[PDB]
RNA sequence: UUUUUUUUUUUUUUUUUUUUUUUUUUCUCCUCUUUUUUUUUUUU
């Protein structure tokens, strides 16, 4: 279990997409929670063309 | 000078069967009178 306290936004997302890529090697599922509508779809768009299905 | 968030119309389909109209009651029952019975025959 990891807690992160930093300042840059995308810098914290590296471990997030590390876990996301790690799930498909484990065949499990992951949930991403974004408590704002604009950011909720930006990560989906970022990871759609990047890999897999979101 | 009034921001931000609260998903939606149950899943399933590629199961066998070798009979035949109907169907099941009603009891014994005083017949009145000119008769033997006439008769061939011919014209259809």
Rounded CA-CA distance A54/A50 in Å is 10
CA of A9 vs C1' of B22, distance in Å?
96
- Name the residue closest to B4, CA to C1': A36
Q: Determine if residue A43 is labeled as part of a ligand binding site.
A: no
Q: Resolution limit in angstroms?
A: 3.7
Method used to obtain the model: cryo-EM
Tally Cβ neighbours within 10 Å of residue A23: 12
Angle (deg, nearest 10), helices A37-50 and A9-24: 50
Q: Would you put residue A2 in left (φ > 0), alpha (ψ -120 to 50) or beta? A: beta
Q: Which residues touch strand B (CB under 7 A)?
A: A 35-38
Number of residues that this document lists for chain A: 54
SS3 of chain A: the string is: CCCCCCCCHHHHHHHHHHHHHHHHCCCCCCCCCCCCHHHHHHHHHHHHHHCCCC
């Amino acid at each position: 279990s990891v807690f992160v306290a930093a300042h840059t936004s995308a810098g914290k997302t590296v471990v997030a997409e590390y876990a996301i890529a790690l799930a498909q090697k484990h065949m499990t599922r992951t949930i991403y929670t974004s408590p704002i509508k604009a950011l909720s779809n930006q990560k989906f768009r970022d990871f759609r063309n990047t890999f897999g299905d979101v």
